Symmetry: C4
Subunit: 490 residues, 4 copies
């Protein structure tokens, strides 16, 4: 009874992350607990360990089945039959426990209590191939022949029947369907892989798929000549590899299939019999098409890694052509380039969209973390309450000046007041000699309470990073807060 | 007379879909019925079955003509002449009924009653090649020779004349023009294919076109050596395939042409005579260029299948670089990632454009289906009339909070009221212990009629999916409806 | 004197198009006539015919020079020296008249009267290579040897000197610089080619460039073995092509170079001497890199032909994922698909940008051509003056309803009035039986003068294409026109 | 002591550019001068010359190590040991001075005074491979064998031990890690290379990397047969290259590796022993995959050079489909094309974004340089002060009319006044005969002070480039300046 608890998802970094909170974990735990009979939750640690063992089984079979069919004349030995029957039992349990399982759609739990509803969905999608690739069809074929024909050994049928055994045993490698199914599942369901698109994981997927195609192709290149008992014009009988060892035969047939794949050649020579020509042609067209598609795939998947730099390069070419179209002096043309490279750093983003997409809690977390220590330094705001403070902070603006600008103009209208955030400025006066501010200071206070002319003029001494604060936004926030609208006059 | 009714489009899932309503079907039915003489409507079931038979004919001819020209020495037998003449009659009827047909431009009916207007358009576009590829030009050439030269058998001309027969019979495979024409027509005119761009259909189109080019190339590789009567340096005479059977000759010449196409080799060896070198060169350059273009095509057509996921990946890289550029704590950096993955689910869309593109009926169908049961639950709105209801519902906003947010802040200005749509929240009070709402409830009613301070503060206990409802939009809709503007005070 | 008039641009479809008006043609005619000495205007018919003859010369030389150097032992005959000297005279006149010519930058006339200013620019860019590839350097080398060495025939130097003649005569094929220069000039300066990017022209450019590289590569593959006098391990001496004819030698060396280019093989065999290995390696790497770059080029240039359809496919995938994310009934999911396919027709555009980019004259030409006959049909507007009419028409909106919509709702607020433009609607009333309007009618008049409730309700009977006309835009235009603001009340 | 000054960055075009101002240069100079012990600033001329010498060393070793291992039987001579020990000393100093160095992150100085903090970061990243590739591991292996085994010469171990010496000496070519590290550093840190993405530099990087892979592959193809002492089926022993010279052996093994890379063939023949087959297979798959990835890379990097022209082509195809969708007369369809080609010149930009991205100083520099001489020409503005002038100039608009437009309409409302900037217009009157203005004039003055009807109507006689100036923007700027609001009435 207590072992029936692993069949429901638990507290685990993967479940916790994909759910968000332990409360959500127990939530589904109960959503499954709506069940009467044991239903496997797809995220239940049981099914994860199941699928791990079954991934090992599927890979072992897809690698070992063809090599055992084609090479190893008289393949039935005391082992390899234990192997096929153990694999068949595991995959039959896979077939059964496949009906009684939790499906997931849209990341929304689809656990379907109705066995028929899950059974119907499985029947539609994959139960047919899983059935055809679960039962040892070759063994039941051999059986319905051994009983019917006593003279099978004496008759030519047994040779036909051994050829049919070797051909029908090839069904077992439709389990590639389950392999790709469970891999896609436990890679997109997997979160640490769902991130970045995991170009490493995806390209290793692709390398594995090409290597498997090439290895099955090699075993095929050797199966088809063998079935016809090595005619005098099959490569196995011109390369004189009839009496060789299964290592050399496999290695060289894999050589041929990989030649055809990369379009580098045929092998030691060019096909000479009709079976060779048609196999070479099928393998050339399939291998070369698949390889070129895989490489177009990986090329696009790599050139999608520098997207946010290609986009900055494009936006700067547009700035270049605007500058040209107005024929700007090559002094301003250099100031502009400096400013761009020192604002977008070879990577584009948008502090307006990327804040119109976030929710209000996240908007406020970023805004607060940015402007807290800055706006808290002023006395006229730090004394107010968080309502007014963090309803004002949403009017701040980002600004990246350049060494030499007149962030303020002497004796001029100062409609906005600035809050510095980085770099260092130097306020200037005709009378006063020098003064500086940096890394969290604030200037321009003479403008907020009353409008007039600025008593100074500051200069960016390095790449300052001020935070703007206008007055129209100010008094719009202000008229919402009469409480502090009254007290500012004094 | 009654059979002249199939020449006009009818009620049919394809016609119904491409027209929209049975009224539109009878509409055109009459637009064609503007005719006096039988005019084929391009969508008339007659022309569809016509084009089906003619597609079968064109494919049969493009596959059977070259193989019959090149191989089969003394090709004229009791069959194959019946074949050419039946094909010629069908294609001549195609030529005639091609003038008297309905053309379609922009999906706007172009049925042109004026025979001259349709005849002139056909003359301009394709009547010339269809004429050159309809009449058995080789037969009339042979005839204007048999009568003129009695000593044709005795003279060397007959050998010249049999070579010219075999060359001029090659015109019949300009019907590829009609094949691609009718396929493009009955694939874009076809709607279930016009959807998704039908990558399956398009890639099968491309595979068919490459296979046809490669098969014509094989027949050419064998035609050109044969015409010169197998010189001692043509592959047919070094591979010792003069006395072979037409199956082996075809299979191996197709082998060579496919080698040249994929750039895997020449064949058994490298060309040795000048005709071989120049054929191999023409075939190499044409095959390799065409194959590489087809594969660039299919690569782009496959990488256009994950567009709406590549675009989410790009937008998230921009969020990454915004986060970096402000150096956010790796707690907020994780909250943001969670929110994104749980709002755009690896697929981008825009509920603002995708509603500014739809018409007003569809805007209202989506808005209604979304917010009906939600806004109907409140008593203060369900009692009003659809005018006010569905003129208000256009101010609702979508919002996806995160487990732990303070969707409401305790004792704070509640300028907007929320309508929940999913998940589950938990209102909280200092005095009250607990309370919940979920899956279609509504809270925040104390704010609409009168403005003040919220008596509570709620928390997202899971990934809530509330629907916002402000008050400025509210009273803007309200001042449009004085009827309910008066009654809300009580 | 009168022949000095062709040196200035004239009235011609190319000049007329690239200038806009015959007044602009005479404008520049005078801008050049600012000259004292004959200056060639780059668009002067003289320079166009010049460049045509010179394009013929450059192509003839790039094809004939290598074939004459490598093959044709003892190449100096009574012809071919006339050929080199005529080509040298034409190209020297090209060098001279290259200084005295009109340059063009930004499509802004750059005709520079100052000979020094044009001379300085030419010196910087291309005068150096044009000088090195104009004078017969091999002839002056031969001359400074014939005079210095009487025993040249007797000495081994003459063999060295004939090798140096054959190598130094290779300079003449730097005229490829001029070829690509003049082609880019007379293709982008050319307008009918500057359109569409002329994918045909550009891909033929690329095919020509690959064919030229491959042909020079063939001549090189034959030059380098020959210079060493056919060592016993050069392909020319294993393929036994020493005593062959220049046709076979050229054809097969071009074969080899094209093999290396496409990466299909080497030739009859694989290199065996060190010169062969290093030539084959240089040619493999250069040919294969260049070919793959050309094909990436042409692939992108073809996949840039269906841009405005790929973009519709992307926008519709985003509509698909919006529909999914709200789980819409598969009835609305089909209405939406119908509307999209019947509004954007598989091709995206933006009637807002494409009207914010045009000038005001073009804005008014399109707006007028669209809405003239429609707005003129109403009596209350046709009686007003073009000022009010065409200041109102800028408030019209485009709208594509769908068979079955209630374009008007019965007894409802009709804030906008519609002008039909296509399709056919059917107004409905409880009392009135039926009525129709189509293809240029207008309805909804009861709303403009006075606001109330609509006395009817219309339905889209086919895919109507109405033109909206609101009342807020109406009275905003109205308050600008008091003249007609007064008279509407009656 | 004074030599300890080069260890800090100085005044230099690279430092000056990457910092912005000499004040910033001395700023960091002091930020480093926060140090007590000599710390290498990564931009210190010392480290730049260091890295130059070390780049020379790394390239020399990556080219000379493999060629010395594989060929040159009995490689230990009086030279080459001096070479390995000098290289080892330089690279060990690299290892030591690697701990005591300035790191840079985000272009923000990361100079870390704490030796442990820099040491810890280096330990994490690359100290491990740099240690494994710094010490002569093969020499210490040989030493711990020479002392232990006196009978090493007599025993079979010495042959094992010479094979292990030749294998373990291969560690030294992990310095490719440092090579790519220092190249990426001194190419992105390098600014003149960081511009344009420097497609030239990047493609030369890629060509160098492919050439190095191919050269190591050649040396490997020769190392692996040699270690097994040239079995009777290694290409070195079928191509009969055992007794050859190291030049021929190297050149032909590089031939083979480059064959496998481009997928052109194997070599003189196809592998025959198991070591040959497996090397050829490893080299085929690695070389072909890497080459195809490099070429996808370079293709995308070249097709990213015409981005701002591809984007204009796309925007114009959208204009084409808008024109079609409204079926415009092919006169307007030509006017529109002329206007586009003469406004966006085959290159797109956005004078609104590209001015919303710039700071306020740069906004004002471009605006001033554009409109200074234009707005200064008018008397009513030039007499005002820069405050009003340059607060007005931000309302100017750009506009490109077309020869024949009525920039003004006769006797019409002239809500905007124009400032010409290029081309030439011709004002017209019923009474007045003719008049012109061009290249910096100004017209439309009768409208600003008082509103009425224009007394004239002008025409674009060429492609004018006026600068618009509305009146609503005018009086909005005006009500901000009462000073000049009063004086305009007179």
């Amino acid at each position: 009874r207590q072992f029936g608890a692993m069949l429901q998802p638990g507290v685990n970094k993967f479940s916790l992350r994909m759910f968000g909170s332990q409360k959500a974990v127990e939530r589904e735990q109960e959503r499954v607990k709506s069940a009467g009979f044991w239903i496997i939750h797809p995220y239940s640690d049981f099914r994860f360990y199941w699928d791990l063992t079954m991934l090992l089984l599927m890979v072992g079979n897809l690698i070992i089945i063809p090599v055992g069919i084609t090479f190893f004349k008289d393949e039935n030995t005391t082992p390899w039959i234990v192997f096929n029957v153990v694999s068949d039992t595991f995959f039959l349990i896979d077939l059964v426990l496949n009906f009684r399982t939790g499906i997931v759609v849209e990341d929304n739990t689809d656990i379907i209590l109705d066995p028929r509803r899950i059974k119907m969905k499985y029947l539609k999608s994959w139960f047919v191939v899983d059935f055809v690739s679960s039962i040892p069809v070759d063994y039941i074929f051999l059986i319905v022949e051994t009983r019917i024909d006593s003279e099978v050994y004496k008759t030519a049928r047994a040779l036909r029947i051994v050829r049919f055994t070797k051909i029908l045993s090839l069904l077992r490698l439709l389990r590639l369907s389950r392999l790709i199914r469970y891999i896609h599942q436990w890679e997109e369901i997997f979160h640490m892989t769902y991130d970045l698109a995991s170009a490493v994981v995806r390209i290793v997927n692709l390398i594995g798929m090409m290597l498997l195609l090439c290895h099955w192709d090699g075993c095929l290149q050797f199966l088809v000549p063998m079935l016809q008992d090595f005619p005098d014009d099959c490569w196995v009988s011109l390369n004189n590899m009839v009496n060789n060892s299964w290592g050399k035969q496999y290695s060289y047939a894999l050589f041929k299939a990989m030649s055809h794949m990369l379009c580098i050649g045929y092998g030691r020579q060019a096909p000479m019999g009709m079976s060779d020509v048609w196999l070479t042609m099928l393998s050339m067209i399939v291998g070369a098409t698949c390889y070129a598609m895989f490489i177009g795939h990986a090329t696009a998947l790599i050139q999608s890694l520098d997207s946010s730099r290609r986009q900055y390069q494009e936006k700067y070419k547009q700035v270049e052509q605007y500058m040209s179209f107005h024929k700007l002096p090559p002094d301003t043309r250099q100031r502009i380039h400096d400013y761009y490279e020192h604002r977008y750093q070879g990577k584009m983003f948008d502090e307006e969209s990327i804040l119109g997409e976030l929710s209000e809690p996240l908007r406020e977390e970023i805004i607060n973390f940015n402007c807290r220590k800055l706006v808290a330094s002023m006395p006229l705001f730090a004394n107010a309450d968080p309502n007014f403070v963090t309803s004002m902070l949403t009017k701040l603006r980002f600004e990246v000046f350049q060494p030499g600008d007149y962030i303020i103009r002497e004796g001029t209208i100062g409609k906005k007041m600035y809050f510095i955030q980085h770099g260092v400025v130097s306020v200037l006066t005709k009378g006063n000699k020098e003064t500086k501010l940096a890394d969290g200071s604030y200037f321009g206070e003479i403008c907020l309470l009353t409008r007039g002319r600025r008593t100074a003029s500051v200069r960016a001494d390095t790449y300052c990073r001020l935070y703007s604060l206008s007055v129209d936004n100010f008094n719009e926030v202000l008229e919402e807060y009469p409480m502090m609208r009254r007290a500012f006059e004094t």
